Design a protein around this ligand. Sequence first.
Ligand SMILES: O=P(O)(O)O[C@@H]1[C@H](O)[C@H](O)[C@@H](OP(=O)(O)O)[C@H](OP(=O)(O)O)[C@H]1O
Length: 364
Amino acid sequence: NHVIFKKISRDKSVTIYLGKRDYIDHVERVEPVDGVVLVDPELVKGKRVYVSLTCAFRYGQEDGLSFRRDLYFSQVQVFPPVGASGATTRLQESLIKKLGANTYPFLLTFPDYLPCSVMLQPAPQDVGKSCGVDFEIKAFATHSTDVEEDKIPKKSSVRLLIRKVQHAPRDMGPQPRAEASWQFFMSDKPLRLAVSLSKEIYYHGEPIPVTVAVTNSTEKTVKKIKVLVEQVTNVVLYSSDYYIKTVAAEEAQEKVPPNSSLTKTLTLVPLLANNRERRGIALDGKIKHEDTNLASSTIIKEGIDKTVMGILVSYQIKVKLTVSGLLGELTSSEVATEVPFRLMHPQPEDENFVFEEFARQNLK
Ligand SMILES: O=P(O)(O)O[C@@H]1[C@H](O)[C@H](O)[C@@H](OP(=O)(O)O)[C@H](OP(=O)(O)O)[C@H]1O
Protein backbone atom coordinates (compact mmCIF):
# COMPACT_ATOMS: atom_id res chain seq x y z
CA ASN A 1 0.00 0.00 0.00
CA HIS A 2 1.99 2.96 -1.37
CA VAL A 3 0.67 6.52 -1.22
CA ILE A 4 1.36 8.56 -4.36
CA PHE A 5 0.88 12.33 -4.55
CA LYS A 6 -0.71 13.96 -7.59
CA LYS A 7 -1.59 17.46 -8.73
CA ILE A 8 -3.57 18.57 -11.80
CA SER A 9 -3.02 21.88 -13.55
CA ARG A 10 -5.86 24.39 -13.77
CA ASP A 11 -6.73 23.54 -17.39
CA LYS A 12 -6.56 19.77 -16.68
CA SER A 13 -3.82 19.23 -19.29
CA VAL A 14 -0.84 18.30 -17.08
CA THR A 15 -0.77 16.13 -13.95
CA ILE A 16 2.27 15.39 -11.78
CA TYR A 17 2.69 12.19 -9.77
CA LEU A 18 5.50 11.90 -7.20
CA GLY A 19 6.15 8.97 -4.88
CA LYS A 20 7.34 11.13 -1.98
CA ARG A 21 6.87 14.61 -0.55
CA ASP A 22 10.26 14.66 1.22
CA TYR A 23 13.46 13.46 -0.45
CA ILE A 24 16.36 12.13 1.60
CA ASP A 25 19.83 13.69 1.90
CA HIS A 26 22.25 11.45 3.81
CA VAL A 27 25.38 13.46 2.94
CA GLU A 28 26.86 10.72 0.74
CA ARG A 29 24.07 10.90 -1.87
CA VAL A 30 20.75 12.69 -2.28
CA GLU A 31 17.59 10.83 -3.26
CA PRO A 32 16.52 11.77 -6.81
CA VAL A 33 13.06 13.05 -7.69
CA ASP A 34 11.52 10.44 -9.99
CA GLY A 35 7.92 10.83 -11.05
CA VAL A 36 5.53 10.82 -13.98
CA VAL A 37 3.49 13.39 -15.88
CA LEU A 38 0.06 12.48 -17.26
CA VAL A 39 -0.98 14.60 -20.24
CA ASP A 40 -4.26 15.07 -22.07
CA PRO A 41 -3.33 14.35 -25.72
CA GLU A 42 -5.90 16.73 -27.22
CA LEU A 43 -4.74 19.50 -24.86
CA VAL A 44 -0.97 19.02 -25.31
CA LYS A 45 -1.22 18.50 -29.09
CA GLY A 46 1.47 20.70 -30.59
CA LYS A 47 2.82 21.59 -27.13
CA ARG A 48 5.93 20.55 -25.22
CA VAL A 49 5.78 19.65 -21.51
CA TYR A 50 8.81 20.13 -19.26
CA VAL A 51 9.56 19.39 -15.61
CA SER A 52 12.05 21.60 -13.76
CA LEU A 53 13.67 21.43 -10.33
CA THR A 54 14.57 24.80 -8.81
CA CYS A 55 16.21 25.51 -5.46
CA ALA A 56 16.16 29.14 -4.35
CA PHE A 57 16.80 31.36 -1.35
CA ARG A 58 14.10 33.92 -0.54
CA TYR A 59 14.14 36.88 1.85
CA GLY A 60 11.14 39.11 2.54
CA GLN A 61 7.38 39.11 2.16
CA GLU A 62 6.49 37.21 -1.01
CA ASP A 63 4.14 38.54 -3.68
CA GLY A 64 8.21 44.41 -7.12
CA LEU A 65 8.57 41.54 -4.64
CA SER A 66 11.47 40.66 -2.33
CA PHE A 67 14.95 39.10 -2.58
CA ARG A 68 15.64 35.87 -4.48
CA ARG A 69 18.93 34.07 -5.09
CA ASP A 70 18.81 30.94 -7.25
CA LEU A 71 21.01 28.10 -5.99
CA TYR A 72 20.36 25.26 -8.49
CA PHE A 73 18.22 24.86 -11.60
CA SER A 74 17.59 21.78 -13.72
CA GLN A 75 14.95 21.16 -16.39
CA VAL A 76 13.95 17.99 -18.23
CA GLN A 77 11.62 17.27 -21.15
CA VAL A 78 8.75 14.84 -20.59
CA PHE A 79 6.55 15.48 -23.64
CA PRO A 80 6.90 14.57 -26.46
CA PRO A 81 8.69 11.40 -25.31
CA VAL A 82 12.48 11.64 -25.45
CA GLY A 83 14.32 8.66 -26.96
CA ALA A 84 13.67 5.21 -25.51
CA SER A 85 11.28 6.85 -23.05
CA GLY A 86 10.94 3.67 -21.02
CA ALA A 87 10.96 3.94 -17.26
CA THR A 88 14.16 4.27 -15.26
CA THR A 89 12.80 3.06 -11.90
CA ARG A 90 10.38 0.39 -10.73
CA LEU A 91 8.17 3.17 -9.36
CA GLN A 92 8.07 4.81 -12.79
CA GLU A 93 7.19 1.66 -14.73
CA SER A 94 4.57 0.70 -12.15
CA LEU A 95 3.04 4.17 -12.39
CA ILE A 96 2.94 4.04 -16.19
CA LYS A 97 1.51 0.52 -15.94
CA LYS A 98 -1.25 1.76 -13.62
CA LEU A 99 -2.06 5.11 -15.26
CA GLY A 100 -1.95 4.14 -18.94
CA ALA A 101 -0.57 5.11 -22.32
CA ASN A 102 -0.45 8.88 -21.72
CA THR A 103 2.02 8.75 -18.81
CA TYR A 104 5.61 9.86 -19.34
CA PRO A 105 8.44 9.53 -16.81
CA PHE A 106 10.84 12.15 -15.52
CA LEU A 107 13.80 12.08 -13.13
CA LEU A 108 15.53 15.18 -11.74
CA THR A 109 18.60 14.84 -9.53
CA PHE A 110 20.09 16.93 -6.65
CA PRO A 111 23.76 17.97 -6.67
CA ASP A 112 25.99 17.47 -3.64
CA TYR A 113 26.27 21.17 -2.66
CA LEU A 114 22.74 22.14 -1.81
CA PRO A 115 21.33 22.96 1.63
CA CYS A 116 18.30 21.18 3.08
CA SER A 117 14.83 22.62 3.61
CA VAL A 118 15.13 25.44 6.15
CA MET A 119 12.67 28.29 6.74
CA LEU A 120 11.99 30.92 9.38
CA GLN A 121 9.41 33.61 10.10
CA PRO A 122 10.44 36.27 12.64
CA ALA A 123 8.85 36.99 16.00
CA PRO A 124 7.62 40.44 17.11
CA GLN A 125 10.91 41.15 18.91
CA ASP A 126 12.99 39.94 15.94
CA VAL A 127 14.48 42.46 13.52
CA GLY A 128 14.97 40.52 10.29
CA LYS A 129 12.25 39.37 7.92
CA SER A 130 11.10 35.87 7.04
CA CYS A 131 13.39 33.84 4.79
CA GLY A 132 13.93 30.32 3.58
CA VAL A 133 15.20 27.85 1.00
CA ASP A 134 12.57 26.40 -1.34
CA PHE A 135 12.67 23.33 -3.58
CA GLU A 136 10.20 23.57 -6.46
CA ILE A 137 9.32 20.72 -8.84
CA LYS A 138 7.28 22.35 -11.60
CA ALA A 139 5.84 20.83 -14.77
CA PHE A 140 4.58 23.18 -17.45
CA ALA A 141 3.37 23.26 -21.05
CA THR A 142 4.84 25.40 -23.82
CA HIS A 143 3.44 26.38 -27.21
CA SER A 144 4.43 28.79 -29.96
CA THR A 145 2.78 31.76 -31.65
CA ASP A 146 2.66 32.84 -35.29
CA VAL A 147 4.47 36.05 -34.26
CA GLU A 148 7.51 33.95 -33.20
CA GLU A 149 7.04 34.12 -29.44
CA ASP A 150 6.61 31.08 -27.19
CA LYS A 151 4.07 31.19 -24.36
CA ILE A 152 4.02 29.41 -21.01
CA PRO A 153 0.47 29.59 -19.58
CA LYS A 154 0.27 29.33 -15.79
CA LYS A 155 -3.04 27.50 -16.26
CA SER A 156 -1.01 24.67 -17.85
CA SER A 157 1.53 24.45 -15.02
CA VAL A 158 1.78 22.45 -11.79
CA ARG A 159 4.00 23.61 -8.92
CA LEU A 160 5.13 21.41 -6.02
CA LEU A 161 7.19 22.54 -3.02
CA ILE A 162 9.06 19.43 -1.91
CA ARG A 163 11.29 19.13 1.16
CA LYS A 164 14.94 18.10 1.14
CA VAL A 165 15.31 16.40 4.53
CA GLN A 166 18.65 15.76 6.24
CA HIS A 167 19.37 12.21 7.42
CA ALA A 168 22.35 10.94 9.36
CA PRO A 169 25.53 9.89 7.51
CA ARG A 170 27.50 6.69 8.05
CA ASP A 171 30.08 8.37 10.30
CA MET A 172 29.77 10.44 13.47
CA GLY A 173 32.09 12.89 15.19
CA PRO A 174 33.90 12.38 18.49
CA GLN A 175 31.98 12.41 21.74
CA PRO A 176 31.23 16.10 22.52
CA ARG A 177 32.95 17.28 25.70
CA ALA A 178 33.72 20.64 27.28
CA GLU A 179 35.44 21.87 30.44
CA ALA A 180 35.05 25.43 31.72
CA SER A 181 36.33 27.17 34.83
CA TRP A 182 35.67 30.58 36.36
CA GLN A 183 37.71 32.51 38.94
CA PHE A 184 35.35 35.19 40.17
CA PHE A 185 36.36 38.68 41.25
CA MET A 186 38.27 38.75 44.58
CA SER A 187 38.21 34.94 45.01
CA ASP A 188 41.21 32.63 44.81
CA LYS A 189 39.27 29.38 44.35
CA PRO A 190 37.85 28.23 40.99
CA LEU A 191 34.38 27.06 40.02
CA ARG A 192 34.75 24.20 37.55
CA LEU A 193 32.25 22.59 35.19
CA ALA A 194 32.59 19.54 32.93
CA VAL A 195 29.88 18.69 30.40
CA SER A 196 29.62 15.61 28.17
CA LEU A 197 27.03 14.10 25.85
CA SER A 198 26.61 10.45 24.92
CA LYS A 199 27.16 10.83 21.15
CA GLU A 200 27.72 13.51 18.51
CA ILE A 201 24.57 13.08 16.36
CA TYR A 202 21.05 12.93 17.79
CA TYR A 203 17.80 12.20 15.99
CA HIS A 204 14.66 14.31 16.09
CA GLY A 205 12.79 13.05 19.15
CA GLU A 206 15.74 11.17 20.64
CA PRO A 207 16.57 11.95 24.29
CA ILE A 208 19.86 13.78 24.84
CA PRO A 209 21.60 12.79 28.11
CA VAL A 210 23.73 15.75 29.21
CA THR A 211 26.12 14.65 31.96
CA VAL A 212 27.27 17.51 34.19
CA ALA A 213 30.04 17.58 36.82
CA VAL A 214 30.27 20.74 38.95
CA THR A 215 33.43 21.08 41.06
CA ASN A 216 32.78 24.01 43.40
CA SER A 217 35.90 25.10 45.29
CA THR A 218 34.53 28.58 46.01
CA GLU A 219 32.88 30.00 49.13
CA LYS A 220 29.67 30.46 47.11
CA THR A 221 26.68 28.21 46.49
CA VAL A 222 25.71 27.04 43.02
CA LYS A 223 22.05 27.92 43.48
CA LYS A 224 20.86 26.38 40.22
CA ILE A 225 21.95 24.12 37.36
CA LYS A 226 19.94 24.66 34.18
CA VAL A 227 20.46 22.68 30.96
CA LEU A 228 19.16 23.99 27.63
CA VAL A 229 19.11 23.04 23.97
CA GLU A 230 19.88 26.15 21.92
CA GLN A 231 19.27 26.54 18.19
CA VAL A 232 21.54 29.06 16.45
CA THR A 233 20.52 30.47 13.06
CA ASN A 234 22.63 32.60 10.70
CA VAL A 235 21.07 34.07 7.57
CA VAL A 236 24.18 34.33 5.40
CA LEU A 237 22.88 35.69 2.06
CA TYR A 238 20.87 38.93 1.90
CA SER A 239 20.78 40.21 5.49
CA SER A 240 23.11 39.03 8.25
CA ASP A 241 20.32 37.98 10.60
CA TYR A 242 21.12 36.08 13.79
CA TYR A 243 18.89 34.04 16.12
CA ILE A 244 19.49 32.13 19.36
CA LYS A 245 16.43 30.32 20.68
CA THR A 246 15.77 27.81 23.45
CA VAL A 247 14.07 24.60 22.33
CA ALA A 248 14.44 22.41 25.44
CA ALA A 249 15.02 23.24 29.09
CA GLU A 250 15.62 21.24 32.26
CA GLU A 251 16.53 22.36 35.78
CA ALA A 252 18.41 20.22 38.26
CA GLN A 253 16.82 19.55 41.64
CA GLU A 254 20.18 19.78 43.44
CA LYS A 255 22.34 22.60 44.74
CA VAL A 256 26.13 22.47 44.96
CA PRO A 257 27.30 23.78 48.36
CA PRO A 258 30.67 25.51 48.77
CA ASN A 259 33.73 23.23 48.59
CA SER A 260 32.01 20.16 47.15
CA SER A 261 31.34 18.35 43.88
CA LEU A 262 28.20 17.04 42.19
CA THR A 263 27.72 14.84 39.12
CA LYS A 264 24.24 14.60 37.58
CA THR A 265 22.74 13.55 34.25
CA LEU A 266 19.80 15.53 32.85
CA THR A 267 17.83 14.52 29.76
CA LEU A 268 16.41 16.94 27.19
CA VAL A 269 14.31 16.39 24.06
CA PRO A 270 14.38 19.24 21.49
CA LEU A 271 10.99 19.22 19.78
CA LEU A 272 8.97 21.81 17.87
CA ALA A 273 5.94 20.65 19.87
CA ASN A 274 7.76 21.76 23.03
CA ASN A 275 7.34 25.34 21.81
CA ARG A 276 3.95 27.03 21.62
CA GLU A 277 5.68 29.88 19.77
CA ARG A 278 6.87 28.53 16.41
CA ARG A 279 8.05 31.92 15.12
CA GLY A 280 11.69 32.88 15.51
CA ILE A 281 13.15 29.38 15.11
CA ALA A 282 14.52 27.57 12.07
CA LEU A 283 12.10 24.97 10.70
CA ASP A 284 12.10 22.60 7.73
CA GLY A 285 8.62 23.70 6.65
CA LYS A 286 5.92 26.30 7.11
CA ILE A 287 4.43 26.93 10.55
CA LYS A 288 0.91 26.04 9.38
CA HIS A 289 1.97 22.51 8.37
CA GLU A 290 1.87 19.38 10.52
CA ASP A 291 4.90 18.04 8.60
CA THR A 292 7.10 20.77 10.06
CA ASN A 293 9.93 19.95 12.45
CA LEU A 294 12.90 21.99 13.59
CA ALA A 295 15.53 22.44 10.91
CA SER A 296 18.30 19.88 10.93
CA SER A 297 21.92 20.85 11.52
CA THR A 298 23.49 22.43 8.45
CA ILE A 299 26.23 20.21 7.01
CA ILE A 300 28.60 22.22 4.81
CA LYS A 301 30.40 20.14 2.19
CA GLU A 302 34.15 20.70 2.06
CA GLY A 303 35.03 23.36 -0.51
CA ILE A 304 31.59 25.03 -0.69
CA ASP A 305 31.15 28.62 0.47
CA LYS A 306 28.75 28.79 3.41
CA THR A 307 26.85 31.72 1.85
CA VAL A 308 25.50 29.26 -0.74
CA MET A 309 23.72 27.48 2.12
CA GLY A 310 21.40 30.49 2.55
CA ILE A 311 20.60 29.80 6.21
CA LEU A 312 22.95 28.05 8.64
CA VAL A 313 21.44 26.07 11.53
CA SER A 314 23.39 24.64 14.46
CA TYR A 315 22.53 23.16 17.85
CA GLN A 316 24.30 23.24 21.20
CA ILE A 317 23.71 22.14 24.76
CA LYS A 318 24.05 25.09 27.13
CA VAL A 319 24.72 24.74 30.85
CA LYS A 320 23.87 27.73 33.07
CA LEU A 321 25.00 27.85 36.70
CA THR A 322 23.25 30.32 38.99
CA VAL A 323 25.77 31.16 41.73
CA SER A 324 24.54 32.71 44.98
CA GLY A 325 25.64 36.23 45.83
CA LEU A 326 27.39 36.75 42.48
CA LEU A 327 25.06 38.54 40.05
CA GLY A 328 24.78 42.25 40.83
CA GLU A 329 27.70 42.22 43.30
CA LEU A 330 30.62 40.53 41.50
CA THR A 331 29.47 40.31 37.86
CA SER A 332 26.77 41.29 35.40
CA SER A 333 27.53 38.33 33.11
CA GLU A 334 26.28 34.74 33.07
CA VAL A 335 28.17 31.63 34.16
CA ALA A 336 27.52 29.20 31.30
CA THR A 337 29.23 26.92 28.80
CA GLU A 338 28.29 25.35 25.48
CA VAL A 339 28.72 21.89 23.92
CA PRO A 340 27.84 21.67 20.20
CA PHE A 341 26.10 18.72 18.58
CA ARG A 342 24.17 17.87 15.43
CA LEU A 343 20.49 16.97 15.06
CA MET A 344 19.12 15.06 12.06
CA HIS A 345 16.75 12.30 11.04
CA PRO A 346 17.91 8.68 11.42
CA GLN A 347 20.06 6.84 8.91
CA PRO A 348 18.15 5.64 5.82
CA GLU A 349 17.37 2.02 4.92
CA ASP A 350 4.01 -4.32 -8.75
CA GLU A 351 2.91 -2.18 -5.80
CA ASN A 352 -0.65 -1.13 -4.96
CA PHE A 353 -1.14 2.62 -5.30
CA VAL A 354 -3.42 5.07 -3.48
CA PHE A 355 -3.55 8.59 -4.91
CA GLU A 356 -3.71 11.70 -2.72
CA GLU A 357 -3.31 15.44 -3.16
CA PHE A 358 0.19 16.84 -2.71
CA ALA A 359 -1.11 19.72 -0.55
CA ARG A 360 0.29 19.24 2.93
CA GLN A 361 -2.10 18.79 5.84
CA ASN A 362 -2.68 21.78 8.09
CA LEU A 363 -2.06 21.68 11.83
CA LYS A 364 -5.25 22.69 13.73
O1 LIG B 1 -1.13 26.37 -6.59
P1 LIG B 1 0.16 27.09 -6.91
O2 LIG B 1 -0.13 28.35 -7.68
O3 LIG B 1 1.03 26.18 -7.75
O4 LIG B 1 0.95 27.47 -5.51
C1 LIG B 1 0.55 26.83 -4.32
C2 LIG B 1 -0.08 27.82 -3.34
O5 LIG B 1 0.83 28.84 -3.05
C3 LIG B 1 -0.52 27.13 -2.04
O6 LIG B 1 -0.89 28.11 -1.10
C4 LIG B 1 0.57 26.24 -1.43
O7 LIG B 1 -0.02 25.47 -0.42
P2 LIG B 1 0.76 25.29 1.03
O8 LIG B 1 0.12 26.20 2.05
O9 LIG B 1 0.65 23.85 1.49
O10 LIG B 1 2.21 25.67 0.86
C5 LIG B 1 1.20 25.31 -2.47
O11 LIG B 1 2.23 24.54 -1.91
P3 LIG B 1 2.20 22.91 -2.16
O12 LIG B 1 3.27 22.53 -3.15
O13 LIG B 1 2.43 22.18 -0.85
O14 LIG B 1 0.85 22.50 -2.73
C6 LIG B 1 1.73 26.12 -3.65
O15 LIG B 1 2.38 25.29 -4.57
